[PDB]
Amino acid sequence: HHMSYTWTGALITPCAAEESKLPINALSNSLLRHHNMVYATTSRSAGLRQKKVTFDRLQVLDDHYRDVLKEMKAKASTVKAKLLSVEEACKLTPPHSAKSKFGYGAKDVRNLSSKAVNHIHSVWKDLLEDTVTPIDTTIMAKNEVFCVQGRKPARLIVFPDLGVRVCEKMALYDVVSTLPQVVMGSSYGFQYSPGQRVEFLVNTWKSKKNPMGFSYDTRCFDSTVTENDIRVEESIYQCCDLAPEARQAIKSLTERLYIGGPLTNSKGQNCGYRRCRASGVLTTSCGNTLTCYLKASAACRAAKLQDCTMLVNGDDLVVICESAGTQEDAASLRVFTEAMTRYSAPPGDPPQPEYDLELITSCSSNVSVAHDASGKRVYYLTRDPTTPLARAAWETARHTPVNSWLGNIIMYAPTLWARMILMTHFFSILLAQEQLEKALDCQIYGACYSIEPLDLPQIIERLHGLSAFSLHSYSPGEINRVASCLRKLGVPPLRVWRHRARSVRARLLSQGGRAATCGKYLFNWAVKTKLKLTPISGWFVAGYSGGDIYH
Ligand SMILES: CC(C)CCn1c(=O)c(C2=NS(=O)(=O)c3cc(NS(C)(=O)=O)ccc3N2)c(O)n2ccnc12
Numbered sequence: 001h002h003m004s005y006t007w008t009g010a011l012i013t014p015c016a017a018e019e020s021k022l023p024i025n026a027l028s029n030s031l032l033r034h035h036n037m038v039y040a041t042t043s044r045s046a047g048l049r050q051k052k053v054t055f056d057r058l059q060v061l062d063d064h065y066r067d068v069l070k071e072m073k074a075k076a077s078t079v080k081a082k083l084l085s086v087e088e089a090c091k092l093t094p095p096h097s098a099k100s101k102f103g104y105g106a107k108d109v110r111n112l113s114s115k116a117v118n119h120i121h122s123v124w125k126d127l128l129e130d131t132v133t134p135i136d137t138t139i140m141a142k143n144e145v146f147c148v149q150g151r152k153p154a155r156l157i158v159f160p161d162l163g164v165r166v167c168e169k170m171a172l173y174d175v176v177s178t179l180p181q182v183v184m185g186s187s188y189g190f191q192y193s194p195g196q197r198v199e200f201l202v203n204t205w206k207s208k209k210n211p212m213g214f215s216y217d218t219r220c221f222d223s224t225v226t227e228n229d230i231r232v233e234e235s236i237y238q239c240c241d242l243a244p245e246a247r248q249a250i251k252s253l254t255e256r257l258y259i260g261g262p263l264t265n266s267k268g269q270n271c272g273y274r275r276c277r278a279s280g281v282l283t284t285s286c287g288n289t290l291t292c293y294l295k296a297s298a299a300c301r302a303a304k305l306q307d308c309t310m311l312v313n314g315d316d317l318v319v320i321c322e323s324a325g326t327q328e329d330a331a332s333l334r335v336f337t338e339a340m341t342r343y344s345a346p347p348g349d350p351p352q353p354e355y356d357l358e359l360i361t362s363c364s365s366n367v368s369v370a371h372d373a374s375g376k377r378v379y380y381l382t383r384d385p386t387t388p389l390a391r392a393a394w395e396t397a398r399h400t401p402v403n404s405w406l407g408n409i410i411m412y413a414p415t416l417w418a419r420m421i422l423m424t425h426f427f428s429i430l431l432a433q434e435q436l437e438k439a440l441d442c443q444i445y446g447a448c449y450s451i452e453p454l455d456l457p458q459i460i461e462r463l464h465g466l467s468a469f470s471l472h473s474y475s476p477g478e479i480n481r482v483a484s485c486l487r488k489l490g491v492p493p494l495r496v497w498r499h500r501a502r503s504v505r506a507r508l509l510s511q512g513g514r515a516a517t518c519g520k521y522l523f524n525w526a527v528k529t530k531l532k533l534t535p536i537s538g539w540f541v542a543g544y545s546g547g548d549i550y551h
Contacts, residue, residue, distance in 0.1 A: 002057045004223040005263075007050060007272035011043075012141050012156070015266040018042035019143075025397040031425050032393040033490030037148050040394065043141035045153035053156065053223045057276075059344045061228070064298040069232065072294060075183045076239035081174040083246045086120055087112060089169035093162075094448045094550035096401060096441075098138075100162035109166060116163075123163040124170065128245065131252040134261035135160055137278060139271055147390040147489065157546065159280025160257055165548045168282035171249035173549075175237055176286035177542045183236070184293050189313030189363065190285070190445050190543035193463045194381040194411055197311075198367055202379050204309045204320045205357045212323035212353050214333060215362045216296065216340065219348040221288060221315035225277035226344055229291045230259045233283070236290055258283060278546070285446055285543035288314040292345070299339035303332045311362065314543060318362035329353040358477070368478045370414070370471040373530075378414075378467055382478060385417040386485050392422060393489075396429070406451060407442040413460040414468040417482050420494055423522050424501040426453070431507050436515055446545030454514040457521040458536050469521045469533050501526035 022028075022038040032038070084092075090109045099105035100119065108116040138161075141154035159165070180188045192200055205211045218224055234254040238247060260275040277284060293312045300308050300319065308321035319336075323329050333351050340347065354360050357367055365383045372378045391404040405426050412418040430436050430453055439450040451459070460468050486493055501523050508519025517536065524530050538551070 002059075002226065002275070003054065004057060004276040005050070005054045005272055005274055007054070008270050010265060010269040010271050012046040012050075012139055012271060013265045013267050014043045014141070018044070019398075020044070022393060023397040027396045027429060028393065031396055031421075031491060032389065034488070037489060038145060038390045038393055039148065039151060040143050040145050041141065041152060041154035042143060043154060045151070046141045046156070048153035049141070049156055052153070053220050053276075055223065057224060057226050057344045059226055059228060060342045062298075062302075062342075064301040064339070065294065065343065068294055068297045068301070072183050072290070073236060073239050076179060076236045077241075079175070079179050079182050079240040081178060081240045081242055081246065083243050084170045084173050086117055086124075086166070086170065089166045089173065090116070090120075092169050092173065092549055092551075093166065094548060097165070097548050097550075098159070098162060102161065102163060104162075106162065109162065119163050120166045123167050124249070127167060127171075127249045127252040127256075131248070131255050133256055135164060135257045136264055137257070137261055137274070137280075139263040139265060145387075145391045145394045147386045155279070157280045158263060158274060158278040159546065159548070160278075164257065165282070167249065168253060168547075169549075171246050171253060172237070172282050175240060175242075175246075175250075176283055176544075176547070179237065179240060180286050180289050180542060183290065184312065187293060187310045187312055188289065189311050189316070190289070191540055193540045194365075195464050196540070197363075198379045198381050201311070201318075201320070201357065201367055204311075207309070208307065208320065208322050210323040211320060211357070212329050212355060213318060213320040213357065213360050214351045214353055215360055216317040216319065216336075216351050217348040218292070218315055218317075218340070218345040221292070221345065222277040222279055222284075224344045224346065225288070225291060227259050227275060229344075230254060230277070230287065232294070233287045233290055234258070257281065258287070280546040280548070282544070282547045282549075284546040285314050289543070292317055295340055295343040295345050298343065299336045302339035303336035305332055305336065313363050314545060316363050318360060323353075323355070326353070358475075368475055370416075370475070370478075371473040372467045373470040378471060380414040380464075380468075380471065382412060382415040382417075384485065385415075385421070385482060386489070388412075388417070388422070389485065389489055389491060392425065396425070401441065402443050402448075403440045404442070406440055406453065407444055409456065410442070410451070410459055410463070411444065413456075413464050414471050416474045416478060416494075417485075419522070419525060420497040420501065421491065424497050424504055424526075427504050427508065427518065427522070428500065431504065436518070444539065445543040446547055447543075447549040447551045449539075449551055454518060457517050461521075461536055463539075466533060466535065469524050470530070472525070498526055 022035045093109045097106040104116040137158045139158050263271040306322040311318045365381045368382050388408045409422050436454045439452045505519045505523035509516050
């Protein structure tokens with residue numbers, strides 16, 4: 001057996017009671033009426049998740065796999081990475097990151113408290129001196145909001161102690177920030193803003209005489225990741241030009257933490273043991289991207305896919321290539337999938353060839369088209385708004401550590417649903433509470449940012465361009481998917497939201513300075529006669545999911 005996990009039978013436990021039911025307040029019904037459709041995951045379903053993630057991995061590595069790996073290593077040898085000082089790593093820690101078991105917290109770390117710093121120094125020395133003892137991790141059930149499909153079990157998060165997390169940053173922050181783009185070039189997804197990611201997909205689709213594309217979804221990717229895969233990742237990091245002390249900390253973190261280790265619940269009991277990827281380590285995003293790109297690149301070769309271009313964001317993969325005709329394309333995908341499977345990345349849903357760029361979903365998103373003020377066609381990234389709307393509903397009535405509505409407006413600003421619903425609804429709330437000035441935390445590509453809502457128009461201009469404040473004539477397909485999600489969740493129809501936005505718009509103007517700018521730029525779509533809109537950040541460098549990174 002090469003089992004992903006082994007279990008003692010101790011339960012995965014909560015550390016703060018959990019709500020599964022959508023909380024309701026005086027604002028809820030204005031956004032969403034079918035309250036019973038929205039739920040949060042809790043520890044109560046941890047047992048179901050444990051079954052889905054617990055399986056035997058077999059791997060067969062052929063010449064295609066080793067050929068790609070050697071090329072990846074040749075690129076990695078051009079990378080030079082530096083160690084971060086204690087201070088620099090401390091400043092990357094989120095103010096609300098889980099406190100250490102060793103008598104200090106995240107604010108202690110960020111303040112360079114001598115207790116915190118002395119302890120981090122001691123963890124670092126222990127990594128230099130010991131490269132064998134498994135390091136403790138905590139396993140928790142995540143509380144995430146979804147719409148019924150009817151329920152998903154809680155996903156599991158596994159993370160080491162704060163002092164270890166700081167040490168991870170010291171050894172590897174520079175490496176995981178710089179190495180993936182050097183190794184993968186334009187295939188590394190986390191270097192693009194949503195605008196850049198649309199342009200790379202459109203330009204890639206166009207670069208083909210006869211385009212064919214597909215997303216590839218690996219079933220529980222983290223669980224498919226073997227000890228071979230994690231040591232092979234380490235062998236890639238070790239190609240970089242690194243201080244000897246960083247070489248030794250990386251080796252040590254790989255043997256004692258990345259490859260596996262014991263799982264402790266929130267109550268201090270032993271839950272079992274992990275031999276696969278931990279979700280809550282610095283390297284999760286870079287490790288998964290390298291491993292997915294290596295297997296997928298080797299699988300493309302096996303399948304003889306012609307002129308493929310891949311786009312990789314951790315475990316999310318899309319491939320666009322030169323079509324060999326429909327029958328040949330479909331056979332090719334079967335071979336690609338057989339190869340991914342021998343490599344221990346079996347499919348969740350069989351992949352399917354697509355000849356319409358707009359019908360491919362990757363990173364939960366698809367390209368679509370609207371028209372700018374001039375009336376030119378404009379590509380932009382959108383998504384099904386069901387999950388964004390369910391989570392906005394939760395957030396309307398409860399403070400949560402991440403405001404998904406804010407990350408969503410930023411990332412999907414050009415979209416019909418973020419503009420009409422999310423902007424209108426949350427600006428209305430913030431105005432009534434006089435909180436436009438209040439910085440709020442959100443997550444982009446796994447990193448935490450503290451963003452003042454009043455800064456949105458500058459942020460959105462910077463990332464999307466001015467056209468985001470004037471898109472119109474959305475596609476019937478996009479319009480229809482939005483309207484159908486509104487009906488499903490009991491959200492008022494778009495015509496109601498345009499009326500509310502005129503009010504929100506007027507109220508924002510009633511204030512001047514940054515507030516009027518929000519009114520003027522964010523809600524220009526809502527007036528009959530538009531105003532002239534004229535012009536009024538290491539954000540997309542790398543992904544950091546589970547990496548405890550604050551920017
Ligand atoms: C270009 C955007 C609009 C796509 C959608 N999108 C994401 O893909 C990520 C993103 N955030 S993410 O860094 O947590 C992540 C992780 C992984 N896989 S793993 C665990 O690293 O192996 C795959 C994809 C993602 N995508 C994100 O933070 N946000 C925010 C708003 N929209 C997005």
